[PDB]
Swiss-Prot record, chains A, C:
Places the protein is found: Virion; Host cytoplasm
Superkingdom as given in the UniProt entry: Viruses
Organism per entry: Thermus virus P23-45
Purpose of the protein: Assembles to form an icosahedric capsid shell with a T=7 symmetry although with a diameter of about 82 nm, which is a larger volume than the usual T=7 capsids. A dramatic reconfiguration of the capsid shell that expands the procaspid from a diameter of 66 nm to a supersized capsid of 82 nm, allows packaging of the large viral DNA genome. The capsid decoration protein binds the expanded capsid and stabilizes it.
Subunit and interaction comment: Homomultimer. Interacts with the portal protein. Interacts with the decoration protein.
Protein name, entry field: Major capsid protein
Disulfide links within the chain: none
Length: 51, 51, 51
């Protein structure tokens, strides 16, 4: 991962540098409205009544 | 004799508006389109009256 | 609505001239049989899972 012959150098403090934000996506139809969820999501598509 | 008539219309909203829709003054979360759908709902209600 | 130089004469009597007839449209599958309604209908489409 660290390329051979090249080194990173931290400067201030060995700690966290920023945060990996997520962003909301679309889920649907709570009652007649939309509901948004933040992180990763896995939606299925049950087309077992299709041809 | 007598024979009626038929009146239908559609109205859609794509992903980019249903996900990215806040306000202008405030830092409101993305759930604004669930309030804005009801306007077009009652507008189609009032538009079938005009025919 | 009436123009400025016009007027509507009603002849026979004061009251309703004719009627506005609602015929039947299709409402989907209340039971195994098909059901029907008459008035102005308004449905939504939940395509909030497709891509």
């Amino acid at each position: 991962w660290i390329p051979v012959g090249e080194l990173i150098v931290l400067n201030q403090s060995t700690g966290p540098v920023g945060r990996f934000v997520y962003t909301a996506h679309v889920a649907g139809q709570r009652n007649g409205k939309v509901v948004y969820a933040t992180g990763p999501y896995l939606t299925v598509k049950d087309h077992l009544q299709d041809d | 004799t007598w024979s009626p008539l038929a009146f239908k219309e559609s109205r859609v909203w794509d992903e980019k508006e249903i996900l990215y829709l806040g306000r202008l003054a405030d830092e409101v979360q993305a759930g604004v389109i669930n309030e804005q759908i009801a306007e077009s709902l009652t507008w189609l209600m009032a538009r079938m009256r005009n025919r």
